[PDB]
Ligand binder design. Structure first.
Ligand SMILES: O[C@@H]1[C@@H](O)[C@H](O[C@@H]2CO[C@@H](O[C@@H]3CO[C@H](O)[C@H](O)[C@H]3O)[C@H](O)[C@H]2O)OC[C@H]1O
Length: 207
């Protein structure tokens, strides 16, 4: 179940992915269902996640209602995000629903709006990545952000509610590539134990 370099597969029903650029190290341990632990040290950029990868044919509306139940013991030692992350293609977009963070609340841009959902209020942002790594190679793509105003590390994230808020604000989404409970570390060290993580699509826990 121990993963310490770039790897994409399926484990216990969930699509897991370990990704880092060069520098420092990380360890991901694949636990039951959507659960996993992560540890990272002196990295530049590292991401650990479990959720679902899609075959790039369906809008989020066609996939259906997405909802994630999670619980994490999150102990970043610097910059890091506890979130729901994923991709669409055509257009190519990386997205983030951030529930907790380390020392710096991302993503440093000007808010475009808010959505009040799952007991909290989130600021909505849109940023741009120029010739950076992506699921399609070195590319230029927008990132979409919902970042909670106060930290939390457990509860329900109503993914489709953020996707509708973004498209309401003019932040359009393509065909789904992935949705996943994600721990991301940036220029830092730390650990996180995701002890609970269930993805529901139209009410049914993933299969
Ligand atoms: O083999 C390919 C993998 O290498 C590829 O990995 C993706 C690379 O890009 C990552 O995203 C970047 C870093 O994290 C934030 O989104 C940054 O802002 C993005 O630049 C993806 O997380 C990795 O999954 O994916 C496709 C696989 O075929």
């Amino acid at each position: 179940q121990i993963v310490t370099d770039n790897s994409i597969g399926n484990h216990d029903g969930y699509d897991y992915e370990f990704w880092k650029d060069s520098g420092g190290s990380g360890t991901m341990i694949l636990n039951h269902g959507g659960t996993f632990s992560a540890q990272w040290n002196n990295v530049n950029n590292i991401l650990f996640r479990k959720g679902k990868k899609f075959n790039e044919t369906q809008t989020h509306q066609q996939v259906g209602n997405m909802s994630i139940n999670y619980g994490a013991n999150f102990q970043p030692n610097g910059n890091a995000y506890l979130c729901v992350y994923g991709w669409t293609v055509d257009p190519l977009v990386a997205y983030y629903i951030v529930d907790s963070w380390g020392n710096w609340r991302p993503p440093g841009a000007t808010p475009k709006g808010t959505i009040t959902v799952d007991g909290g209020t989130y600021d909505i942002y849109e940023t741009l990545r120029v010739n950076q790594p992506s699921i399609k190679g070195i590319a230029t793509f927008k990132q979409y952000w919902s970042v909670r105003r106060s930290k939390r590390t457990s509860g329900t994230i109503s993914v489709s509610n953020h996707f509708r808020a973004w498209e309401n604000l003019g932040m359009n989404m393509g065909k789904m590539y992935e949705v996943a409970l994600t721990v991301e570390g940036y220029q830092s060290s730390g650990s996180a134990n995701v002890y609970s993580n269930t993805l529901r699509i139209n009410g049914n826990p993933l299969s």
